[PDB]
Each structure stands twice: as C-alpha cells, then as structure tokens.
Amino acid sequence: THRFVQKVEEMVQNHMTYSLQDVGGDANWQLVVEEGEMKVYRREVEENGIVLDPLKATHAVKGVTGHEVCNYFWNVDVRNDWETTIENFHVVETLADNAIIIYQTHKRVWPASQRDVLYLSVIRKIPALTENDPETWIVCNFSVDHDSAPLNNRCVRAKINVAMICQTLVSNQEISRDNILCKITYVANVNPGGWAPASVLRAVAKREYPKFLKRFTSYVQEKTAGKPILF
Numbered sequence: 001t002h003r004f005v006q007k008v009e010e011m012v013q014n015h016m017t018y019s020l021q022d023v024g025g026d027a028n029w030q031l032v033v034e035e036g037e038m039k040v041y042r043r044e045v046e047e048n049g050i051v052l053d054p055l056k057a058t059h060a061v062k063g064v065t066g067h068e069v070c071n072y073f074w075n076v077d078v079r080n081d082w083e084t085t086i087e088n089f090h091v092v093e094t095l096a097d098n099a100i101i102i103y104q105t106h107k108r109v110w111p112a113s114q115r116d117v118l119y120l121s122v123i124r125k126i127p128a129l130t131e132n133d134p135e136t137w138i139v140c141n142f143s144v145d146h147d148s149a150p151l152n153n154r155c156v157r158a159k160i161n162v163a164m165i166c167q168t169l170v171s172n173q174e175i176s177r178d179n180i181l182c183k184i185t186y187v188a189n190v191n192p193g194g195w196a197p198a199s200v201l202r203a204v205a206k207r208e209y210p211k212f213l214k215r216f217t218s219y220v221q222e223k224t225a226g227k228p229i230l231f
C-alpha cells in the first residue's frame with residue numbers, strides 16, 4: 001500500500017521479538033533512575049567515541065489504555081502539549097492513516113551542534129500471539145531517508161529507533177478507569193550522528209527521559225479523565 005510496508009513490519013516485529021523482554025533480572029542493563037513504577041535503564045555504548053547508549057524504560061500507568069497512550073504519542077496535533085525539547089516540526093509525507101514521515105529539530109544541547117531528525121512514525125495494533133496473551137499497541141519512530149529533507153546548516157542529522165509499546169490489563173456493566181492499568185515498555189536507540197561530549201549527553205539523557213515519561217503519561221491521564229474509555 002506504500003513503499004515502507006515491509007520495512008515497517010520488520011521494525012515492529014523486531015521490537016515485538018526483542019524489546020519486550022524483562023531486564024529486572026538482567027545485569028547487562030544498568031538501572032539508572034527509578035521513580036515508583038517508572039524504571040529507566042541504559043547500556044553504555046560508544047561507536048567511534050560517540051554515545052549510542054540504548055535506553056529502555058518500563059512504567060505502569062493507572063486509568064488509561066494502551067490504545068489511548070499510543071494515540072496521544074502518535075498524534076502530531078497534541079505534540080506541543082507534552083514535548084519540551086522540540087524547536088520545529090514538519091510533516092513531510094503522509095503514507096497511510098497510521099503512518100507519516102516527520103522532520104524535527106531539537107533544542108540545542110551545549111556545547112554540541114543542534115540536531116535534527118527525519119523519521120517514519122507508525123501506530124499499529126498487534127494481536128495476542130497466543131490466546132492467553134495481551135494484545136499490544138505500538139508506536140515505532142525510526143529514521144528513514146527522504147528527498148524533501150530540509151537544508152538546515154545549524155543541525156547535524158541524528159538517527160533514531162524508538163518504540164512506545166503498551167499492553168493493557170483490566171479487572172452488563174462497563175469497566176471503570178479505576179480498574180485499568182497500562183503497562184509501558186519504552187525503548188530509544190539514538191545515534192547523535194557526529195561529535196558530542198559523552199558526559200553531557202549522558203547527563204541529559206538521565207534527566208530528560210524520566211522527565212518525558214512522567215510528563216507524557218500524566219498528560220494522557222489528564223486528557224482522558226472523565227471521557228469514555230477507548231480500548
């Protein structure tokens with residue numbers, strides 16, 4: 001239906017195969033920040049002296065569904081209500097009702113050059129693998145090449161592979177939001193795309209990933225409160 005259908009299936013299946021695994025028991029992941037049910041881990045990885053540090057976080061959010069969380073994370077029309085590190089944003093291409101290509105710039109992290117990013121953003125429902133298992137809602141944001149890439153001489157091009165992966169547990173009567181819990185696994189593999197001082201990048205990640213997870217999940221709770229549930 002569009003030229004990236006195969007690529008999207010590969011990227012989504014890779015996350016379903018590899019990104020949901022538990023890391024509580026895994027000494028290969030460093031637990032860097034914990035705030036209640038939010039647990040943020042990383043691995044320290046550098047390629048040619050540039051930090052790549054894979055980031056993986058888990059969180060458990062009361063009173064929202066995975067379909068709601070993924071809709072709010074994917075919908076560009078609400079981005080400004082929760083994002084705090086974006087300078088500019090442009091939708092470059094619409095591929096399908098659930099897949100777009102975006103260009104964005106991030107606020108500069110001194111003393112490195114400002115970064116920009118050009119990525120496909122897709123939202124998918126993955127049916128339960130065995131009938132005992134939960135369904136999954138996933139948003140995957142991953143870098144792609146495009147000709148309508150902006151000339152932006154202030155920016156170095158980063159590359160990203162990010163997924164927000166959600167599974168929803170629920171306890172003639174509707175289910176209340178009191179009885180719904182969204183289990184999130186968030187993974188971010190960011191390649192800065194050129195020089196940056198490692199200690200600064202690592203301090204920024206350790207502050208900004210928890211700040212994002214807290215602000216974004218709180219935002220979804222706030223916007224859904226008192227509205228009918230979208231499962």
Ligand SMILES: O=S(=O)(CCO)c1ccc(-c2ccc(C3CCCC3)c([C@H]3C[C@H]3c3ccccn3)c2)cc1
Nearest residue numbers: 085106109115141158162190192204205208209212
């Ligand atoms: O979840 S998303 O898809 C949401 C749509 O935007 C996402 C999140 C984060 C990034 C991103 C892009 C650039 C950087 C670095 C690279 C060198 C200089 C800036 C970082 C590192 C610094 C970390 C960070 C973490 C959270 C928010 C922003 N910054 C992160 C991109 C996309």
